[PDB]
Amino acid sequence: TLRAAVFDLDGVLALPAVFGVLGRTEEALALPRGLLNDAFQKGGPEGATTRLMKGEITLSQWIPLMEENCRKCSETAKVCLPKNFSIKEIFDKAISARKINRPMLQAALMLRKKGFTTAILTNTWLDDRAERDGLAQLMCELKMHFDFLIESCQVGMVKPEPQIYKFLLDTLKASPSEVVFLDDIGANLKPARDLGMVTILVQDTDTALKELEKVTGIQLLNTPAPLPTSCNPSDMSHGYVTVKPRVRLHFVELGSGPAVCLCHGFPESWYSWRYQIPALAQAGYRVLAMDMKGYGESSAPPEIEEYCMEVLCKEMVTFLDKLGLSQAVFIGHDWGGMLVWYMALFYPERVRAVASLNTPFIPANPNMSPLESIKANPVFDYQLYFQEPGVAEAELEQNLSRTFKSLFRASDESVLSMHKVCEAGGLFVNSPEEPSLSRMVTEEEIQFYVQQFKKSGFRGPLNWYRNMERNWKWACKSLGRKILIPALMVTAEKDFVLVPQMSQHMEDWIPHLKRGHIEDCGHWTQMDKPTEVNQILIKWLDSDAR
Amino acid sequence: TLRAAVFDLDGVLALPAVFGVLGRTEEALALPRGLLNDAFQKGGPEGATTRLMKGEITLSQWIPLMEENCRKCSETAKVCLPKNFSIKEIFDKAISARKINRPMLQAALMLRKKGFTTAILTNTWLDDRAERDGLAQLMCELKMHFDFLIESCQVGMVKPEPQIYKFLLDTLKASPSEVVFLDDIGANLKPARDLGMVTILVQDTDTALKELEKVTGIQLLNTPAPLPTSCNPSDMSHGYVTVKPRVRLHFVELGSGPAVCLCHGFPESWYSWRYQIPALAQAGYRVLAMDMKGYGESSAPPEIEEYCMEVLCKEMVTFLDKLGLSQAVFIGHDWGGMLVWYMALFYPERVRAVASLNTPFIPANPNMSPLESIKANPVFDYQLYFQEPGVAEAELEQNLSRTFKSLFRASDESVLSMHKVCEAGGLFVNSPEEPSLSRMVTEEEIQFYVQQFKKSGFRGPLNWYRNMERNWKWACKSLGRKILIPALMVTAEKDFVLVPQMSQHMEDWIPHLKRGHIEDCGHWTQMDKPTEVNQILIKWLDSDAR
Ligand SMILES: Cc1cc(-c2csc(N)n2)c(C)n1C[C@H]1CCCO1
Ligand SMILES: Cc1cc(-c2csc(N)n2)c(C)n1C[C@H]1CCCO1
Ligand SMILES: [Mg+2]
Ligand SMILES: [Mg+2]
């Protein structure tokens, strides 16, 4: 029966509520109880506050009107307001104090995931104060999680007037009995109740969630910890930069602050960062999540040498030049990880800080051909399989779904040993035609990769492995250097190819290296353990790159 | 004969030179003359400094080696270095002191404009110091003006070794006699001279330019003031954001820092900001230059109401939401100017600051239909001509070249009165078939507009004028408000439609409004007077939006 859920902002999705600051200020300053609330509410439907909430005036215009109300209320109550008493001050403080009430948001999200239409209906104001950016941030963060946001000041109507509830119903395209509405102000619930909406009076959050859960029949309290926000591709800003005549690079871009360029591994996509992109933007960064050369909407030229580390890095520099970015933080995974260590070594002036997931920095061995070095570790045998042009392409392109479904698996699910792949004759020779779906991914997410890979297939991707000799000679030039910019290495316990021990000597080349470590994490770090990756990146960004 | 020009960075394109800081520090600290230069040069081809310039070691690794050289030089000269003596300190200071030597850059630019290939050949280092971003900025700003940048540390070779000059010649694809090479170090010129290159020894800039001018036969000194840098479309980052199912918005994006969204007028393009985009990025801003809805690579739906101010503003808010931007500075011109005043009035929380070129803020008159208000000023008669769907489209689309060439004219060139356009039967009824080219634009620039307008023509653009009644009713809601965020109004003396007097009452609605005024400037402000626009925007941005 219930199809829709409506939440107020103050006192419901965000806490502490501003009205609360009226109460507290009175208490703190020993003013007559309720004096501030009388001033706030003076003139009722035609007083300053209603005009504010309806959009007739802006917040900065209302401030001196509330001031005047406070004077008149205090003269009528035969008291004086203290020296320094400041309405602007009180509200600046109150509005920055108010934070997202996380469990209410997570309930709204769960309800939306089970197919509810969700909305925020709020009495609010046009905010033109010097510090308005703080509220603009909160509203952005909240509203992306909901179907609709209805603000009194944008629509010219306020709770409890009946017309806003009619406007609500019409926006929802639902009848009143299909709607639950939560509010901390009982007067605001009444007209919803009159129409036959389920209403919940929100005092403490848990009891409201308990009622919300009873009435919807959905579990909202004590639920497992949810994944971070992911990205819908068609909701993103897509950027494109031509770095030379045949080569354009595509990226997705979210947030403001220091530029952070995310570089995925093989055979992946910008979308492999879907769980980090909103979190890093939310934490105060400008994220640029690349399709690396060879992939997705980036160009994919056929020639092997187009994909050696030197050419790749030079193009990433050009990509910064054309965007007008003197630096970025570079964060890489797998092949992207190797590339970011090379950026740090050859273009430290362009790199604000460098981090890798899984991929250690290993210096070239000038006394050993890289082919031999690769042949020395049985777990890299899949890289020899990748050498011969055409062979891996045919296997990987033959059935894309099966390809991504076989590759993208958590450590407790794996179907492919990386073991004696040449000898066996292929990566999939002993995996099913139709693999089961990993817990890490949905069917929809697999089909995003399949559709990406239909544009250019695996030639350009595989070519990143086909420049061992060329990369080795370029790397040998850097053998006297050290990496002395801020650097983070993140090892994954159960990546059985890029094993955490393989990073064990990095402090010789990177003496101030920082570390994080993720337990029970396979090769596909960002989607295996997105919460833990997010926390380790944001903590290191805030301390080292900011 | 000469086809190419090569410039050193230190002492040639940037000043004061670092070597100079060796001299000055000695003098300042009363050290033995030349002591620092001996330490710097110790071991010659195999000393620390050469290894640095060749890329073997990074700057931070070299710092303690130069320190040690300075100790050994001072022990051998029987003196002591002062307490606090700091090589890191000296170089931090020297490297931030060094600025682009503007007249040398402007000579290189002029030579490139007359078809020279230009290059920077420099002995430089891999810079990993905490403060490296300053040099990364200088190198970005310089290098975008040149065909090639050749850095000793990237190529593994240093002036004066002969191999780098061979590498130079090969990069230029020129024989030595086709090249002029400028350097402040005579030892560095010699191998160019040995090959038969024209060389110039740069002491003071003017005498070097004088020799450069004699030898090339091109005027480089005492030249008129050049235009600001413009944008090549195919060198820009292009961004695309879907703000709702039928509507995607395209923009060009350059720079980092506070987001600044540029909104062009009718019938224009992101490209109309070509002279502001590099300057504002260079001044420390993130520029987003839109194709407004109706234009260029943005969607262009046919329906009139898709283009009312309300829908337009809501979509600009969504564009911020999807990019993850809690605010931007909004700067508009003509129709874009009207739109930014509306953003300031309806979404002040999303607007960091607002500026308009030409377009004044005028409140709706609630006692007069907007059609009448328009009929009251003979100079708006072209807006009535625009009302009837199809009529203006046919005239404007009939011959695009003639359209843009007739419209885009400086005030001393105009071919169209805005006068009794309905009565005359068209905007062009009395202008030539093939207008002459305005001084403001090249043939190439006109053809960029023509090609943009072949995608959707003039329907969507004209529709911005066809919502007078709808805009009037929306505007009436804002009649109690004031604009109290930072605001700049820029009037143009000779815009005979949007006249500077029309802005004269703006202080009633915008009490802290700032102003700039541009004399001898017609309607097409950004390209008429790009230098003056740039200076007024950047000064106001730095003081009000930063
Ligand atoms: C960690 C690592 C070691 C080597 C290696 C060793 S010797 C040689 N030539 N290469 C390579 C190529 N990697 C990169 C990883 C990331 C994905 C590709 O393998
Ligand atoms: C300055 C201005 C006044 C009016 C106006 C007056 S009364 C009414 N309805 N409109 C308009 C539409 N403008 C906007 C300019 C910029 C380009 C379009 O004209
Ligand atoms: Mg409330
Ligand atoms: Mg020099």
A419 is catalytic: no
Query: What six digits make up the tokens of A196?
Result: 């036959």
Compute CA A520 distance to the chain's CA centroid, rounded to the nearest angstrom. 22
Residue A239's H or E segment, with its range, is strand A237-244
- The active-site residue out of B342, B495, B523, B528 is B523
Fold: same for A1-16+97-217 and A17-96: no
C-alpha distance from residue B106 to each of A143, A199, B506 (Å) = 49, 70, 40
Cα(B50)–Cα(B153) distance, rounded to whole angstroms? 10
Cα(B222)–Cα(B202) distance, rounded to whole angstroms? 18
Cα(A245)–Cα(A248) distance, rounded to whole angstroms? 8
CB contact under 8 A, A237 and B236: no
Terminal CA-to-CA distance of chain A, rounded, Å?
50
Cα(A15)–Cα(A13) distance, rounded to whole angstroms? 7
Cα(A332)–Cα(B513) distance, rounded to whole angstroms? 47
Terminal CA-to-CA distance of chain B, rounded, Å?
50
Q: Specify the DSSP class assigned to residue B390.
A: T
Instruction: Write the residue with the smallest CA distance to atom 8 of ligand 2.
Output: B370
A137 vs B238, B253, B326: nearest CB: B326
- According to DSSP, the residues that pair with A243 across neighbouring strands are none
At CB < 8 A and 24+ separation, what contacts does A432-440 make? A432/A402, A433/A399, A433/A402, A434/A402, A434/A405, A435/A402, A435/A405, A435/A406, A435/A409, A436/A405, A437/A405, A438/A405, A438/A408, A438/A409, A438/A410, A438/A413, A439/A410, A439/A413, A440/A408, A440/A409, A440/A410, A440/A524, A440/A527, A440/A528
CB contact under 8 A, A255 and B324: yes
Residue B251's H or E segment, with its range, is strand B247-254
CATH architecture of B1-16+97-217: 3-Layer(aba) Sandwich (3.40)
A347 is catalytic: no
B307 is catalytic: no
In chain A, residues with a C-beta closer than 8 Å to the C-beta of B254 are 323-324
CB contact under 8 A, A140 and B240: no
- Smallest CA–CA separation between B231 and chain A, in Å? 11
Ligand 2 midpoint to CA B18 (Å): 56
Q: Residues 425 to 464 of A: which have CB under 8 A from any B CB? A: none
In chain B, residues with a C-beta closer than 8 Å to the C-beta of A63 are none
Cα(B256)–Cα(B274) distance, rounded to whole angstroms? 17
Closest residue in chain A to residue B285, using alpha carbons only: A324
- Residue A469 carries which side chain, given as an amino acid letter? E
Cα(B434)–Cα(B440) distance, rounded to whole angstroms? 17
| CATH classification code of A17-96 | 1.10.150.240
State which approach was used to obtain the coordinates: X-ray
Domain boundaries, chain A: 1-16+97-217, 17-96, 236-546
Ligand 1 midpoint to CA B58 (Å): 24
- Is B56 an interface residue toward A (CB < 8 Å)? yes
Cα(A228)–Cα(A532) distance, rounded to whole angstroms? 10
In chain B, residues with a C-beta closer than 8 Å to the C-beta of A255 are 324-325
Neighbour tally for A392: CB within 10 Å: 24
C-alpha distance from residue A14 to each of A158, A460, B62, B199, B358 (Å) = 19, 48, 54, 70, 42
Ligand 1 midpoint to CA A372 (Å): 12
In B175-330, alpha helices (H): 186-195, 205-216, 276-282, 309-323
Is B430 buried (19+), middle (13-18) or exposed (0-12) by CB count in 10 A?
exposed
Q: Residues 299 to 328 of B: which have CB under 8 A from any A CB? A: 321-327
- Is B154 an interface residue toward A (CB < 8 Å)? yes
C-alpha distance from residue B199 to each of A191, A305, B4, B347, B525 (Å) = 87, 37, 12, 60, 43
Question: Could you tell me if the CB of B497 is within 6 A of ligand 2?
Answer: no
Cα(B226)–Cα(B224) distance, rounded to whole angstroms? 6
Q: What letters, b where the CB count within 10 A reaches 16 and e where it falls short, cover B188-218?
A: bbbbbeebebbbbebeebeebbebbbeebeb
Residue with tokens 């190198």: B139
A324 vs B254, B321, B483: nearest CB: B254
- According to DSSP, the residues that pair with A518 across neighbouring strands are A492
B37 annotated among ligand-binding-site residues: no
Query: What six digits make up the tokens of B292?
Result: 């407004």
| CATH classification code of A236-546 | 3.40.50.1820
Cα(B240)–Cα(B242) distance, rounded to whole angstroms? 7
A520 annotated among ligand-binding-site residues: no
Query: What six digits make up the tokens of B9?
Result: 């960075």
B255 contacts B273 by C-beta, under 8 angstroms: no
CB contact under 8 A, A482 and B61: yes
Residue with tokens 């090549």: B232
At CB < 8 A and 24+ separation, what contacts does A191-199 make? A191/A159, A191/A160, A191/A161, A191/A162, A191/A165, A192/A165, A194/A162, A195/A165, A195/A169, A197/A165, A198/A2
A458 contacts A428 by C-beta, under 8 angstroms: no
A328 contacts A298 by C-beta, under 8 angstroms: no
Cα(A30)–Cα(A282) distance, rounded to whole angstroms? 39
